[PDB]
Amino acid sequence: VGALVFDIGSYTVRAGYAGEDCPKVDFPTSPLKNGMVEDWDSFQAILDHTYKMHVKSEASLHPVLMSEAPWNTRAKREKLTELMFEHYNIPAFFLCKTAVLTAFANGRSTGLILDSGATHTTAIPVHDGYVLQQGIVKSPLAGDFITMQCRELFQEMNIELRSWHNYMCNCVIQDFQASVLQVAAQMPTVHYEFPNGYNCDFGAERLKIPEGLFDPMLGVSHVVTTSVGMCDIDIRPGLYGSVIVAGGNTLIQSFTDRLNRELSQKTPPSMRLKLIANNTTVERRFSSWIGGSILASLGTFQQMWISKQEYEEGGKQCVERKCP
Amino acid sequence: EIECFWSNIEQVVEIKLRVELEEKRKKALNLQK
């Protein structure tokens, strides 16, 4: 009956038990193009695949937690509870924002979260665990844009970079990012080889490709600097001293270093700006699910969840009432 | 509640750190002995 924690993230779904450290299953996610559920049939099918194939357990026994995007609309949450409770008949439910779970994973309730996924990169200030909706800044310069710069450059190289083939294409442009991309001006470079053995001297492209998210649209540094501008006046020092990053799409070499430089030179020099270096791929990919797991584990989650009794007593209204 | 969890973990970290320094002292003492 160990509590189950799922992340339904846009580009890879992370699932696991509340008490376990890592999402035991992490597979590619689609019904979440803009950030919330686009296709209820497909989303339901993938969830069913999750419980049955991925974790080999029925949803009628374990308590369940799901996480939704900070900017998701309310109807999405209401329909999500309706679908989940009616179809899978879980004993208790909860919903949490991914940015809040990122700030919890870092053990820092008051924070600013930078994260990106399919088609979106966002900056969210969270104060005492509440996402300031008015302060969120959302930009299209996501990992998809950089990976498409990569894909265009590869096509210009003319390499031969059904759906499974496209998945492979996206993965290789992603795999190339982790090894090569770093944020003649770059000096000799790597010999990264394709599975078939093809390769090249990946030179200045490794520098120019990551430069898009800063300068191709609002770059990440501007995204965050305006995000705090739209928030409260006096909590702003707290956010700068608590800036956090999450998401696998953020995994570029010296990416966090360039962010720290950009914010330090953009923030007033007197300010205590600091970035929490959870820079490892494992850390960023597990951050949100980690927060969900901690949230579920505690002895108070037994009172925070939406018990099946609650949904029997009342309908979709409970999500707005029980989930911040 | 999460802050309380992290403070509990902080207490565990502090006690483990103290115990590890004490064991460092013990290891040095045994090594010189």
From Swiss-Prot, chain A:
It is found in: Nucleus. Changing residue 272 to W: Found in a patient with developmental delay, speech and learning difficulties, dysmorphic features and abnormal digits; likely pathogenic. GO terms for cellular component: brahma complex; chromatin; GBAF complex; Ino80 complex; kinetochore; npBAF complex; NuA4 histone acetyltransferase complex; nuclear matrix. The keyword Acetylation applies. One of its GO terms (molecular function) is transcription coactivator activity. Keywords: Acetylation, Activator, Chromatin regulator, Disease variant, DNA damage, DNA recombination, DNA repair, Growth regulation, Intellectual disability, Isopeptide bond, Neurogenesis, Nucleus, Phosphoprotein, Transcription, Transcription regulation, Ubl conjugation. SMART domains: ACTIN. Its main location: nucleus. It holds the Pfam family Actin. GO terms for biological process: blastocyst formation; chromatin remodeling; DNA recombination; DNA repair; negative regulation of cell differentiation; nervous system development; neural retina development; positive regulation of cell differentiation. The modification Phosphoserine is found at residue 30. Involved in transcriptional activation and repression of select genes by chromatin remodeling (alteration of DNA-nucleosome topology). Component of SWI/SNF chromatin remodeling complexes that carry out key enzymatic activities, changing chromatin structure by altering DNA-histone contacts within a nucleosome in an ATP-dependent manner. Required for maximal ATPase activity of SMARCA4/BRG1/BAF190A and for association of the SMARCA4/BRG1/BAF190A containing remodeling complex BAF with chromatin/nuclear matrix. It is linked to ACTL6A mutations have been found in patients with intellectual disability of variable severity, developmental delay, dysmorphic features and digit abnormalities. Additional features may include genitourinary and cardiac defects. The disease phenotype resembles Coffin-Siris syndrome and brachymorphism-onychodysplasia-dysphalangism syndrome. Belongs to the actin family. Component of numerous complexes with chromatin remodeling and histone acetyltransferase activity. Component of the NuA4 histone acetyltransferase complex which contains the catalytic subunit KAT5/TIP60 and the subunits EP400, TRRAP/PAF400, BRD8/SMAP, EPC1, DMAP1/DNMAP1, RUVBL1/TIP49, RUVBL2, ING3, actin, ACTL6A/BAF53A, MORF4L1/MRG15, MORF4L2/MRGX, MRGBP, YEATS4/GAS41, VPS72/YL1 and MEAF6. The NuA4 complex interacts with MYC and the adenovirus E1A protein. This is Actin-like protein 6A. It comes from Homo sapiens (Human). The gene is ACTL6A.
UniProtKB/Swiss-Prot annotation, chain B:
It is found in: Nucleus. Component of the NuA4 histone acetyltransferase complex which is involved in transcriptional activation of select genes principally by acetylation of nucleosomal histones H4 and H2A. This modification may both alter nucleosome - DNA interactions and promote interaction of the modified histones with other proteins which positively regulate transcription. May be required for transcriptional activation of E2F1 and MYC target genes during cellular proliferation. Component of the NuA4 histone acetyltransferase complex which contains the catalytic subunit KAT5/TIP60 and the subunits EP400, TRRAP/PAF400, BRD8/SMAP, EPC1, DMAP1/DNMAP1, RUVBL1/TIP49, RUVBL2, ING3, actin, ACTL6A/BAF53A, MORF4L1/MRG15, MORF4L2/MRGX, MRGBP, YEATS4/GAS41, VPS72/YL1 and MEAF6. May also participate in the formation of NuA4 related complexes which lack the KAT5/TIP60 catalytic subunit, but which include the SWI/SNF related protein SRCAP. The NuA4 complex interacts with MYC and the adenovirus E1A protein. EP400 interacts with TRRAP, RUVBL1 and RUVBL2. It comes from Homo sapiens. This is E1A-binding protein p400. The chain holds residues 876 to 908 of 3159 of the full protein. Belongs to the SNF2/RAD54 helicase family. SWR1 subfamily. Ubiquitously expressed.
